[PDB]
Design an enzyme around this catalytic site. Sequence first.
Site, PDB file in Angstrom:
ATOM      1  N   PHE A  20       0.780  -1.251   0.000  1.00 37.35           N
ATOM      2  CA  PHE A  20       0.000   0.000   0.000  1.00 37.35           C
ATOM      3  C   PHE A  20       0.810   1.298   0.000  1.00 37.35           C
ATOM      4  O   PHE A  20       0.270   2.323  -0.352  1.00 37.35           O
ATOM      5  CB  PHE A  20      -0.890   0.039   1.245  1.00 37.35           C
ATOM      6  CG  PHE A  20      -0.095   0.004   2.524  1.00 37.35           C
ATOM      7  CD1 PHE A  20       0.588   1.144   2.978  1.00 37.35           C
ATOM      8  CD2 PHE A  20       0.034  -1.178   3.242  1.00 37.35           C
ATOM      9  CE1 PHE A  20       1.355   1.102   4.133  1.00 37.35           C
ATOM     10  CE2 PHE A  20       0.810  -1.225   4.392  1.00 37.35           C
ATOM     11  CZ  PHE A  20       1.464  -0.081   4.840  1.00 37.35           C
ATOM     12  N   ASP A 136      -7.035 -10.254   6.745  1.00 41.47           N
ATOM     13  CA  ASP A 136      -5.551 -10.268   6.699  1.00 41.47           C
ATOM     14  C   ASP A 136      -4.964 -10.155   8.100  1.00 41.47           C
ATOM     15  O   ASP A 136      -4.122  -9.289   8.413  1.00 41.47           O
ATOM     16  CB  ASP A 136      -5.073  -9.138   5.780  1.00 41.47           C
ATOM     17  CG  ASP A 136      -3.623  -9.302   5.333  1.00 41.47           C
ATOM     18  OD1 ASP A 136      -3.088 -10.430   5.222  1.00 41.47           O
ATOM     19  OD2 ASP A 136      -3.015  -8.246   5.115  1.00 41.47           O
TER      20      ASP A 136
HETATM   21  C1  LIG Z   1       4.029   0.396  11.863  1.00 44.54           C
HETATM   22  N1  LIG Z   1       2.620   0.417  11.381  1.00 44.54           N
HETATM   23  C2  LIG Z   1       2.327  -0.362  10.330  1.00 44.54           C
HETATM   24  C3  LIG Z   1       0.996  -0.183  10.079  1.00 44.54           C
HETATM   25  C4  LIG Z   1       0.296  -0.820   9.108  1.00 44.54           C
HETATM   26  C5  LIG Z   1      -0.687  -0.161   8.348  1.00 44.54           C
HETATM   27  N2  LIG Z   1      -1.436  -0.857   7.380  1.00 44.54           N
HETATM   28  C6  LIG Z   1      -1.177  -2.223   7.149  1.00 44.54           C
HETATM   29  N3  LIG Z   1      -0.217  -2.889   7.929  1.00 44.54           N
HETATM   30  C7  LIG Z   1       0.490  -2.206   8.857  1.00 44.54           C
HETATM   31  N4  LIG Z   1       1.399  -2.856   9.573  1.00 44.54           N
HETATM   32  C8  LIG Z   1       0.467   0.697  10.971  1.00 44.54           C
HETATM   33  C9  LIG Z   1      -0.793   1.167  11.122  1.00 44.54           C
HETATM   34  C10 LIG Z   1      -1.134   2.076  12.117  1.00 44.54           C
HETATM   35  C11 LIG Z   1      -0.097   2.478  12.951  1.00 44.54           C
HETATM   36 CL1  LIG Z   1      -0.445   3.567  14.214  1.00 44.54          CL
HETATM   37  C12 LIG Z   1       1.207   1.968  12.806  1.00 44.54           C
HETATM   38 CL2  LIG Z   1       2.465   2.642  14.060  1.00 44.54          CL
HETATM   39  C13 LIG Z   1       1.480   1.080  11.803  1.00 44.54           C
END
Ligand SMILES: Cn1cc(-c2cncnc2N)c2ccc(Cl)c(Cl)c21
Length: 327
Positions: A20, A136
């Site tokens: 993404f 997921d």
């Molecule tokens: C480090 N991190 C990674 C995501 C993330 C986002 N989308 C899909 N997989 C993920 N892992 C993610 C989403 C919200 C926040 Cl606050 C943090 Cl610190 C995030």
Amino acid sequence: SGDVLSARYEIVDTLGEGAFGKVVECIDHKAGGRHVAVKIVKNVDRYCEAARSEIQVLEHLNTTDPNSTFRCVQMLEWFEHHGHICIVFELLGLSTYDFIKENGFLPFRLDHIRKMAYQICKSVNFLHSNKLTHTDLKPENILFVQSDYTEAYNPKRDERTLINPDIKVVDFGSATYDDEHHSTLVSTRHYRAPEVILALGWSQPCDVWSIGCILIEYYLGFTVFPTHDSKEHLAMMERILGPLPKHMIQKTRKRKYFHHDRLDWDEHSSAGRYVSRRCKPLKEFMLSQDVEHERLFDLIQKMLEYDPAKRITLREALKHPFFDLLK
Ligand SMILES: Cn1cc(-c2cncnc2N)c2ccc(Cl)c(Cl)c21
């Protein structure tokens, strides 16, 4: 980095990359240099639309559960910048994957697992109530609220330990409502349910399979499905859980995977021997046959029921003996 977005957020650092796009840490200069995470979505159709969906999902869930009682990440605002969708979130700590990894894949202590599990089951049962399926779930998408430690020693080196093992679920870009279009292929491979693999249709149970796979990993510190091939993943399920049921076999159109009415797998092939070596009957994985461990494993086993209709629900799972020491 040092780059300003929305004239308030200064990127300091990168917390995560991905399909993404990326998640960065920002200082918010209009909120007294307090810190947030910002997800910067790639300038690419399928990601903008997953992000648009994430935002609608998260507004609904902020409406329904404004205090994240049910442990979904809180989205604070969204905007655009150079045609990237940008989602601002509360700053979380490390993913549960990053934490284990940064401990040399030392498994979690059972007391921390019981809890973490309870929260994950709470969070996703709350989605399952609002007719959403996450699709997921994996340790990369379960994050600690902050991941602070004690640098305590041990004679079997200097590990870090969890004061406060509170988690939130993240990544709602793939969450699918019952009444919406269902993608054919969901989940990351190692956390993917047999009904997905066999193209039987899926719904909320597929999340429960994934949850089962996560708890095994929290306990073992490694995956029990070390594969990137669909048939072999099935051969691994069989070695760990017994044969697939006839009616799933009868019903799938993935005929490729089957001979007569049985998995087309030669156990004495090279791949056959790899599976026999890395995979074995579920309970033979247990590091102790005390009562608590039998309970984890009774749960896991129920979350790994092949038949999605027969598989335990998170409603039921939230009342599993395994969860008693919590009240
Ligand atoms: C480090 N991190 C990674 C995501 C993330 C986002 N989308 C899909 N997989 C993920 N892992 C993610 C989403 C919200 C926040 Cl606050 C943090 Cl610190 C995030």
